[PDB]
Every structure is written in C-alpha cells, then in structure tokens.
Design a protein around this nucleic acid. Sequence first.
DNA 1: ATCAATATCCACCTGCAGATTCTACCAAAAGTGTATTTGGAAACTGCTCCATCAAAAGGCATGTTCAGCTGAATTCAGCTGAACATGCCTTTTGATGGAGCAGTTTCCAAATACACTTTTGGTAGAATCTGCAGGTGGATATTGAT
DNA 2: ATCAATATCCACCTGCAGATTCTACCAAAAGTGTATTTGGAAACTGCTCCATCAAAAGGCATGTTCAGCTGAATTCAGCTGAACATGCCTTTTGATGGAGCAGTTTCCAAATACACTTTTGGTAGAATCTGCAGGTGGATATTGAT
Lengths: 79, 86, 99, 99, 106, 106, 98, 94
Amino acid sequence: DNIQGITKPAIRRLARRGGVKRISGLIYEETRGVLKVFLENVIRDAVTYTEHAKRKTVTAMDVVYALKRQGRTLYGFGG
Amino acid sequence: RHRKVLRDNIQGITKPAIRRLARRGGVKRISGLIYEETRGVLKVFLENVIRDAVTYTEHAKRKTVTAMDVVYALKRQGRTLYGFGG
Amino acid sequence: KPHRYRPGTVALREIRRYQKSTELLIRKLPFQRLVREIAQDFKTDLRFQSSAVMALQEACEAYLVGLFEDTNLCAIHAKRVTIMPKDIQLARRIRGERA
Amino acid sequence: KPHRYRPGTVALREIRRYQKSTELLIRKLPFQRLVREIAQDFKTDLRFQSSAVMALQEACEAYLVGLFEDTNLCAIHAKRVTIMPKDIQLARRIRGERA
Amino acid sequence: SKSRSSRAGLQFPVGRIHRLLRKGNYAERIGAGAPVYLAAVLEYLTAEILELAGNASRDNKKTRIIPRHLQLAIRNDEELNKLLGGVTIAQGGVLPNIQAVLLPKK
Amino acid sequence: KSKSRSSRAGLQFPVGRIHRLLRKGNYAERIGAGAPVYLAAVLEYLTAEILELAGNASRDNKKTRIIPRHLQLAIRNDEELNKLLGGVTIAQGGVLPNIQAVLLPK
Amino acid sequence: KRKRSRKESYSVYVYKVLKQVHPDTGISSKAMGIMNSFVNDIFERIAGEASRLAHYNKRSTITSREIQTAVRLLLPGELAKHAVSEGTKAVTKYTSSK
Amino acid sequence: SRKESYSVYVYKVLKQVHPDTGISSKAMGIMNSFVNDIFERIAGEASRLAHYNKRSTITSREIQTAVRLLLPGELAKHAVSEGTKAVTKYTSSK
DNA sequence: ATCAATATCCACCTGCAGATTCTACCAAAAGTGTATTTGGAAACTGCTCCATCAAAAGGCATGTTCAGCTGAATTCAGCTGAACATGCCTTTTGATGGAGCAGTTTCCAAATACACTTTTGGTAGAATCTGCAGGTGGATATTGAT
DNA sequence: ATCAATATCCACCTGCAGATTCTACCAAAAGTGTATTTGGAAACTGCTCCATCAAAAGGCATGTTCAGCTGAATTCAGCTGAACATGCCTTTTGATGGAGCAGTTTCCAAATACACTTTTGGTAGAATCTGCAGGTGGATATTGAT
Ligand SMILES: [Cl-]
Ligand SMILES: [Cl-]
Ligand SMILES: [Cl-]
Ligand SMILES: [Cl-]
Ligand SMILES: [Cl-]
Ligand SMILES: [Cl-]
Ligand SMILES: [Mn+2]
Ligand SMILES: [Mn+2]
Ligand SMILES: [Mn+2]
Ligand SMILES: [Mn+2]
Ligand SMILES: [Mn+2]
Ligand SMILES: [Mn+2]
Ligand SMILES: [Mn+2]
Ligand SMILES: [Mn+2]
Ligand SMILES: [Mn+2]
Ligand SMILES: [Mn+2]
Ligand SMILES: [Mn+2]
Ligand SMILES: [Mn+2]
Ligand SMILES: [Mn+2]
Ligand SMILES: [Mn+2]
C-alpha cells in the first residue's frame, strides 16, 4: 500500500529522537498502524473544516484547527 | 464563634480506604509503600481542584464554595463531572 | 482446625464486591476535614455547600480508582501482580497530566 | 579485515544525532502520498496546500517521537531496553488513546 | 399559537434553545434552523442514552434508571464511551473487569 | 493621539488592536477599557519571558538568530513554560536531548 | 416578598423521551441530574464549535449548517450519522409548515 | 489582502531584552501562534467567568482571574503584577 | 475424589422515602410588524497546485555474521494478606442561631454611539547581512590486543 | 589499566545565495471630541442552608500474628536485532504550462433582530403513588483441607 512507504529506517529514525536504543521486529508494522489512525483522525476533521467552507483545497489552517480540537495544538502554521 | 484547628488530615485517608479504591480499580495485591504514595498523589489532586474552585468563589465575591465552583474547576482540568448542576 | 482462605482469594472477592457497587469508599467526615484543611490554606473563613464537598469526593474517588486501574496495568507489564510506587509514577508520567 | 562497532553503539550515536537536530524524519514524498490516500476515503478530488501537508507531517512526527519516549519508558519498566508492540499498546491505553 | 418544538416534531424545547443560543455569546445572529437542529441532536443523543440505560435497568430488574445504569450504558457502548471519555458519572462506579493474570492458577 | 494607548500603559503590545479583537471575538456583550490593557500587558510579559530564555539558547549556540529550535529548548527547559505549553508542538523544534540512564554503556 | 426564581431545566423533556423509548421505566432524580448535565455539556460543545466555525469562516450567523458541521466534528461516526438525520429531518419539517 | 500579525510587537520586545539578537521567519511564526494561543485561552476563560456570574462585561477583573486560573504559580504572579501595573499607568495617563 | 465451611444468590414482605401526578400562578415563548443585515448568486481575475518532464544522488532494500539481550528456569527470604480482639469515632438524626446567598431598588462610573482626524502596520522592492554547505584538522571516544 | 589504531564529532573559517532588515507609500484602523445610555455596584433584607452541637450505637480502623506465595536475584541458551558491505531505485529537484478555484466585489430576495403584546407551557410546592432498601431465611456454588 502507501503505508509501506513509511520505511524501516524512518520509523527507526523517529524512535531515535525518542531516545530508543533497540527495536523489536514487529514494531515497524505496529507503528504503521498507529500513524494511520492518527492521520485518519486529523484528516477526517481537517477535511470537515474544508467541506464546511465550501472549499476543495485543504488549507494549513484547516489542519491547525483539526489538530487543536484533537488536543494537539501546532505552532508555526497560523501564517 | 470558633473552629478547632485542622491538622494533618491527609492521614484520615486510611489504609483500608486506599485498599478499597484500589479494589474498585481491580488491584489484587498492594505494596506497603502504596498508601503513603497515594496520600501524596491525592493531596496534589485535591489542592489543584480546590485552588481553582476558590478562584471561582472569590471572583463571585462569595464566601461559600458552591458545587458549581467545583464543577467549573473540574471542567478546566479536563475532568468533567455530571450530577451536580450546570 | 479453623478456616483460612488462600492469600489472594479474599482480595479477589473484594475486587468483585467493590466493582458492583457505586458507594463512596473514603469515609465521609475525614474527607470533608481534608477539604476544609486545604481550602483554609488558600482562603480563610470559607463555607461549603454540602454538595460542593460531595462533588469533590466523587471526583477524587473516580480519579484515584482510575489511577489504580492504570497502575495495575503497569504492574502486570513488569510481570507482577503487586502495585508499587514505581507503577503509580510510571502511569502518572505517561498520561502526563501530572509528572 | 574490517571494523565493527559493538551492537548498540551505533544506536546511541543515532540517538544523540537526531535529538540535537530538527529535520523531518519521514521522507517527504512517501508521506504526501500517504496523506492523499487517507484523505480520499473522506472526500474526493481534494487539493492540498504544501503547508497543509507540511503541517500534517510536523504533527505526526512530533506525536510519534513522543509515543516512542513513552513506549521506551514502558520497555524499561519491564527491565528491557527493546521496545515491543506490547509497550506501544500500554502507552496508548494509559494516554487514553485506547480507553 | 403553534409551538416550535411540535412544529419540528420534537420533544426538546426549540424556543428555549433559541434563547440559550442568542444569549450565550456564540455569534451576533442565530439562524431560525439552528436551535431546531440542535434541539433535534440533543433530543436524539438523549434517546440513545435512555434506550441503552433502560436495558441496563431491565437487566437488573429495576423500574427506575439510576446513575449506575447510566454508567453501564455509557461505558459499554463503544461510541458513547468515546463521546464521554472525559466525563465522570457521579455514583456510577466502574465496569466489572478483572485482568486475566489476577485469577487463580494451577 | 499624539501619544497612544499602548504608550500610555507603557506597553509595546497593541492595546488598541487587542481591544478590537476582544470586541469581535464573541466573548461578552461589553469590553471595559481596562481589559485589553490588562491582556496586552500579560501577553507582552509572557512573550518577554520566552524571548529572554530563547535568546540565551542562541547566545549559547553563538548564532544571534533565534530559530524554532531555540524556542523549544528555551521553553521545554523551563518548568513553568513547559506546564503552560505542555500540549503544544513547536514545529521544527525537535526534542530536548535526553537518554535514559539505564541505556548508557557500562 | 422574595419570589424564589424559577430554575429551568431539561427534566420534563428528558422524561418524555424516557417514556417514548421505555414506557414502563422511570428515573431517579440523581439519574436525572446526570441527564441534565449531559444535555448542557453537549449543548456547549456543539455551540462552542459552531461559534468557532462561523468565526473562522467570517460569518456573523450561526445557521443550522454550522450546527451540523459541529455535530460531525464532535460525534463518533455512527452516532453522528444518526444525529444528522434527525436534525436534517427536524428542520425541513420545521420549514414545511407555518 | 491585508494580513495582520503580532510580528512588529514581538520584534520590539525582542530588542528590548536582547538588542543584539534577531529572529527567523519561522521562529516568528511560532511566536505569533503562542500569542494567538494565550490570547484565546485568557479571553475564552474571561468569557466564561462573566457568564457564570451573569455579567455582560469583560473587565480587567475577569482578565486577572483568568490569568490566575490559566498560568503556573510564579508565571501567574508576574503577569498579574504587569497587568495591574499597566492598568494603573494607563489610568494615570488620561 | 469428597465433605465442612462460607459466601453468594435469590425470593418474599412491607412501610417509607423518594419519584410521579396534580394545580395554579406566571414568566417566557410565540405573534405582529417594521428596521436592518447578510450570505450568497453571477461575473471576474491572479495564484498556488497538479500534471508532467526527466536526468543524478544519496538513501534503502538485501543478505551475512555474531554479540548480546530476552525469556525461561530455579530458589528463597521476607513482605503482604487473612483473621480477630478492641475500642474509637464516624454516622445518624434533630435542633438552633445566624451568616450570607439571592432579590429589589436606585443611580452613576463606565460603556456605547457617531462624526471626524491621525497614525500605523502591511507591503513590496532596494540595500544589507547571515547561516550553511563543505572542508579540513584536532579533540573525543571506541574497539581490540597484551 | 595501557597503547595502537581507526572512526566520528566538533571547532574554527569562507564565500555567496537566500533571507532579514530597510524605505517609502497608503488604505484601514486606532484615536478624538461630544453626546447619550446603562450594567451593576452599593445598599437593604428576606430567608435558605451552613456550621455546630449533642448523643447514642455500631460500623469499621488499628495493631498484631503467622505463613503463603510473590518479588528479587542468578544463570544461561537461543534466537532476535545490530552493524555493514553492496548495488539498485525511489525520491529530489529544478523549471514549465495549464487549470481549477480560492478570493473579492457588487447587488438584493430572504432572513434576523427588536419592541410590544397576547398566550401557553413549565415550574414550584402540595397531594398522591409506589419502587425498592433492609431484613429474613433457604437453596447453590466455591474454596480449601484430607
Ligand atoms: Cl491552616
Ligand atoms: Cl553465543
Ligand atoms: Cl557546520
Ligand atoms: Cl586532504
Ligand atoms: Cl515470581
Ligand atoms: Cl526479597
Ligand atoms: Mn492548615
Ligand atoms: Mn438556520
Ligand atoms: Mn473597568
Ligand atoms: Mn446578614
Ligand atoms: Mn422602581
Ligand atoms: Mn511604520
Ligand atoms: Mn559570517
Ligand atoms: Mn555542514
Ligand atoms: Mn450620539
Ligand atoms: Mn432616551
Ligand atoms: Mn439598568
Ligand atoms: Mn484501636
Ligand atoms: Mn396549560
Ligand atoms: Mn435488597
């Protein structure tokens, strides 16, 4: 699928920033599943904002608003 | 015309009460240090909610903490309570 | 001669008992005393509505019960059936609401 | 002939490298193609601002970096230095992502 | 007169919800349809909770729905649970749940 | 004015603009003259407190540009600012450098 | 002297709906307090989100269209689908007569 | 086409505490978000206060209370000193 | 493999506290009728975005080796659960005094409402600077052999 | 612990494109001066509801005993996951056109706000109903010792 483009090294790189030293083999697939739910939850909302504005283009703000109501405020895109 | 000084009341959160809460939580077995640890965790919890409730009380220039002040305090900590108004 | 249940069996009996009831588990008066002690260190001569104290107890018990659920999972995670302070601290750190 | 670092030392060096930097860690095109597939199940013929997808990526990585911190802690709690699926699953249950 | 609730085929008070929206600092103006719509939703989620909660009462051979039946209803439904995931039902207790590892062995 | 509301409060932040933003934000029917003054002052203060610590991150890195990395370091190493922004993400901010003790060799 | 003010509530309406879905069931006052808190909570979540939408999109009016979006944002899906049907059906019905 | 922002005000404050330091375009985007976030937090809470207390006006007294609820201990104390100090200076001014 | 020992279920009854029903006063919907807005419905533009194009680079998919960790197995000291005697203190239930919510009026310091006047911040090129992409070279830390 | 011997970081510099800062204009906000309202603060004050008290009675907390079974400690095999050399290909990147469409203006039919005025529906106690909490006592399932 497209999910598979989230590669072993990338998933591995993120864990490194997270301070992880060693990584069980089933993780990369488990992590792929977690990233999908995340992306889904945000995108469902981000697009709900889009449709409401009668637009066909998801804007940065649409994403910002979607992130905020998910308890995950993002700084740096409100302009 | 008076009120006897309140001291050291966190200790009235008894070992058996802590055991009982832990049971409702599904806990089968309890380390000896759990009960002092829980009193400290509870005191922080209580302080924070009570501090906010009173900020609501004072703002209304009241001398009575109401259930609504407490509901409002719980709400802004993300712990909404049903069953007390508003 | 006399009877003795195996260690852990009354504990399980209690888990069921307390999970089927909704009664408050902290004694009512000692808790009210905790609340007034703490309020008084913030602002003095405060009165309380009776419902104000019951709401605080209800919130505190639901919170602590919840915190005990999460603490149990952390214990079980480290292959134990006993909750220890490191378990509360780990649960609190994640769920980073507090530590 | 050749040189070989002991298992774990290249790992720590990677931990240091990436915690002192801020570049995005998922490569750009695979992420953008992921984002559009998911979007399509909700709404069709959708356009995206580059910055919208840039923000979506910023959030995901920040979320995932954080989840690996919490997973790490769970791993260590059970006396391991290896993150396993059970560790990710415990961190999300405590974060209430599972409830 | 002819009532706004009944004119919408609703039980919930369209008029009171109109007032609550106009005086609640949400927007300078309120559409005529908004409180009708909002009342419909509030009425529907209420039907849905009272449905599930009544079942909890009949299961428990009670006539009256008490907060425990509400909690069971809410926490046992995957969507109401998520919707009220950050809420506390006073006197509601918890769901019976004993982790498998804790049950007696051998 | 010949001298403005900001300057009369001894402020850098826009008292006048914050007053308008309050009025058009569906917060209350009325906004007192003192409210945007008070709000601008706090916002200027919190901004000052952040840029203070953040300049220090750039002094340390010997670059006199504050970039998002410096805000992050600045913010996350201050306990109170961390609490204030515990649910916020600084884009391009990375994480504080930290490795758990158990993971180190020897 | 001193007329004690009416305290409005949702109870009468909660009970009408209680009787519709469960005619032989009743509800304790302390369960009704739970229901009033619930109606006011969801009320606020929807109106608040409706407030933001109209604000984001520079509209000075909260129409049913802003209520709906809020419902879609705030509700889990199967519950949202149904909430939307009831709402859409209530408004068209409201417009059709009078 | 006019896009308002806090940048000029953020830059004034920067020079005042660190005259020799500047700020990047995307660090500036962060500062604007922060200012728009705390504005929204404080104003929103002041709205609720005036509402709970059946008051139709947001006065500085509600801003202060809001600040006390929203900010950590030491951070709140200075913010309240600053706000109170700005209001009195503003009242003295004219 | 069986019984004492308990605990847990499960019904049945009854009076009473707590829900439901009943009424009457009345605030607040609901109706009327002008006074104002506003959210679009067409007609237009300047842009970001998608569709393509199409070579090169570094990042990643693959396969091999081997170190080092995870999970299993064992053992045992002492911690925590079960059970009980003892008696304190929480819980009940009612009464009483009074503090302080909450309701009503009255009336200004404060807020709104307009018509004009000034300032300011945003904007977009011109005139400056500044990190970083690259490159050593020395410092620092790693790994293996004695 | 030391010495060699690679390997990777990290400082300290450089030249120049890519950003930041810098100027000059200007719509659009912020401000002024006046003219009028008006939310809510202050001041009674009627009454809920809170704080205490008193006592009787038992529910439940404390402190203790004693051993079961859990947690902590150790060892180790095997199999997973790290480290690396090899070489392929997916992702970057650097412009190029065409288009879809987000953005703005400019009118109006339809929709909303308001001040009065007329009409119920909803609320607060009374006045009835009626579950279900406590209290018994007998059937059943579970647990643990032999
Ligand atoms: Cl004290
Ligand atoms: Cl081996
Ligand atoms: Cl460099
Ligand atoms: Cl060379
Ligand atoms: Cl064990
Ligand atoms: Cl031990
Ligand atoms: Mn004290
Ligand atoms: Mn409408
Ligand atoms: Mn004022
Ligand atoms: Mn008095
Ligand atoms: Mn009068
Ligand atoms: Mn200027
Ligand atoms: Mn330079
Ligand atoms: Mn470089
Ligand atoms: Mn005028
Ligand atoms: Mn007049
Ligand atoms: Mn008035
Ligand atoms: Mn004793
Ligand atoms: Mn009637
Ligand atoms: Mn019973």
